[PDB]
Ligand SMILES: Cc1cc2nc3c(=O)[nH]c(=O)nc-3n(C[C@H](O)[C@H](O)[C@H](O)COP(=O)(O)O)c2cc1C
């Protein structure tokens with residue numbers, strides 16, 4: 143069951159084909175995997191752990207290479223339970239001599255496991271570790287995407303074990319990046335980044351620079367989820383893209399998302415979608431009842447403009463638009479132009495409220511929100527056409543620098 | 544397709560068995576109906592209309608009694624499109640002499656239909672209209688649930704035609720309240736009230752005061768949706784209940800709703816549910832990923848305390864919790880004790896935020912929110928039981944005047 147990466151390095155763990163609800167916050171339409179890394183040396187070391195419920199597959203995999211009693215070192219790089227869920231089981235089965243974790247990792251281990259007597263040892267940034275013939279180097283990557291986050295570097299073998307970093311939610315027979323079509327791989331990478339790492343874009347960038355600062359140029363990047371990046375070109379692929387993702391530069395893409403009860407806000411949205419298309423923008427029109435918030439977020443990640451519609455419902459906006467907005471704000475998308483619109487019957491707060499949201503997210507609002515009393519008319523359409531042109535011109539402007 | 548209520552009065556329209564998404568904001572798990580009433584007089588009159596897509600079933604039903612072109616009068620009591628959507632088709636088929644609507648109704652009628660030459664005639668609160676042998680009386684019921692809302696009274700026949708008021712989403716072969724079990728009938732009435740009329744509880748009470756003030760004591764109540772209330776006892780039941788619904792008096796019921804990614808907030812919730820039971824409360828423990836916002840609302844309608852849990856997700860609360868609170872805040876539930884709890888990893892804003900939400904809704908917060916770093920301990924459990932005891936204590940007090 144274990145998969146050879148290179149001599150003495152195996153990928154063990156579990157393929158979770160069925161995962162759809164990914165850890166309660168986003169979706170993983172292609173399932174996911176839980177990746178752990180067994181390193182054979184004087185000190186036999188296991189890097190990462192899996193979801194509690196997959197302890198069996200992990201020990202089965204390990205056992206296919208070595209009797210679990212022979213592992214001496216446990217390296218825990220992230221204390222999220224999909225990574226650390228099996229730690230108690232592995233301690234029991236392996237009776238490790240030393241459990242290695244970052245300084246922030248040990249705190250989180252405590253608050254997650256409240257453990258009595260574990261041979262825990264905190265390593266520090268750039269610290270090194272002899273495993274025998276091989277030596278691992280530890281780098282801290284706080285807030286990527288948790289404070290405990292740290293990565294492991296094998297300078298000689300050029301193997302980076304990156305915990306969630308560079309992860310992608312892909313369940314498949316293929317475990318390496320080069321066995322998978324680029325378009326699939328990449329969309330999965332972006333989906334993954336946009337929905338969890340995005341609010342730590344800056345740390346993304348600083349983290350990459352100092353790893354580059356050090357001599358980290360992998361041939362292997364080994365994430366907790368998805369396929370292994372195999373090859374200096376692939377690993378370079380990975381790092382470029384992370385840089386591109388954290389940078390969040392605008393494109394000629396417009397994402398409009400809305401909800402509606404009686405379709406007036408839907409009609410406005412459809413007209414906006416058409417006007418933008420006329421200004422040369424690529425348009426995604428997404429209904430909140432048909433699109434998960436993480437799906438809107440994935441589309442928003444490389445969009446230049448985000449336009450939001452809601453009718454006024456009980457002195458506010460529809461629940462599903464509010465939820466999606468809360469989601470998006472949390473992930474802190476950068477460099478976007480905002481837009482807002484809706485239908486109302488009397489009090490009309492929705493566009494006011496929508497504008498507060500976007501503004502509060504640092505979105506640029508060149509055009510004022512179009513609000514319409516109930517069912518829109520040709521004039522109202524003219525107004526929307528106008529809002530669309532203003533936004534697009536500003537967009538067009540932004541993309542020229 | 545027409546149903547004889549009393550001599551010269553027929554129920555026409557459409558049974559919508561498949562309705563689940565009810566008009567974009569709530570659920571109609573039992574389907575719904577679109578009720579219009581044909582009254583045979585010298586001046587033959589049609590009250591209400593149906594969703595546009597059912598104009599055919601409506602005309603067929605109508606025609607079962609009389610040729611549609613014989614209808615003289617159209618009374619439009621609510622301009623929401625499930626009530627007024629077939630108005631254009633009916634003007635066409637009936638060529639009515641007069642369209643009767645409220646003053647605020649004629650307003651909404653233009654911003655929805657933008658009509659050019661319609662014989663619209665505004666009726667006033669208390670105005671009467673001779674239809675020939677019968678005479679109908681019009682009462683205004685603004686914000687029940689739109690400004691244009693008005694109801695129609697047949698004082699001699701003791702027939703109240705009430706638009707959405709008293710409506711229930713029930714699709715069935717049975718069209719009368721006495722043909723369905725009360726518990727079924729009642730639950731649907733509350734579900735209907737709780738998710739659309741609740742913010743207008745005061746108007747609810749006022750309007751009921753004035754109809755009774757005048758001599759409205761119906762033998763039949765005829766709403767837009769669901770079964771007809773047949774018999775003064777039934778009609779008294781309906782009005783009894785609306786008063787009860789609008790009064791929102793506490794009960795010993797606690798509704799706990801939460802979302803969670805790694806189940807620690809769930810465990811806290813499960814503990815809470817048990818303590819509250821221990822305090823002799825009835826508990827509804829509802830997961831936002833499994834329960835529609837409208838469902839939670841229905842449970843909350845007669846609960847005395849609302850407890851909300853969310854882990855901290857990106858410096859805030861989980862989207863589905865936010866969306867549900869948004870929904871709930873708009874429906875303005877009254878006389879409720881609030882509570883909050885959650886797990887966090889570092890920033891810990893969720894309970895802070897939940898508290899601001901509850902307090903902003905005017906909820907009483909006798910107990911401090913319980914927050915836990917990651918995975919809770921017995922001690923944390925102790926805190927929650929304590930929390931549950933404080934809130935329940937406060938509940939009990941309230942329940943004795
Ligand atoms: C359940 C419900 C709640 C409403 N509450 C409000 C309100 O608070 N303020 C408002 O101005 N109109 C409100 N309206 C009216 C809608 O905003 C109006 O019908 C609008 O045109 C609906 O847009 P849509 O077609 O995009 O659904 C409400 C309508 C519904 C059905």
Ligand SMILES: Cc1cc2nc3c(=O)[nH]c(=O)nc-3n(C[C@H](O)[C@H](O)[C@H](O)COP(=O)(O)O)c2cc1C
Nearest residue numbers: 804805806807808854857858886888889890891917
């Ligand atoms: C997607 C993600 C985002 C997080 N966001 C934060 C954060 O902004 N602030 C914080 O203190 N905790 C954060 N946490 C940590 C969770 O709140 C912590 O794991 C908590 O125990 C989750 O509770 P739950 O088991 O009820 O899901 C985050 C964890 C996840 C997986």
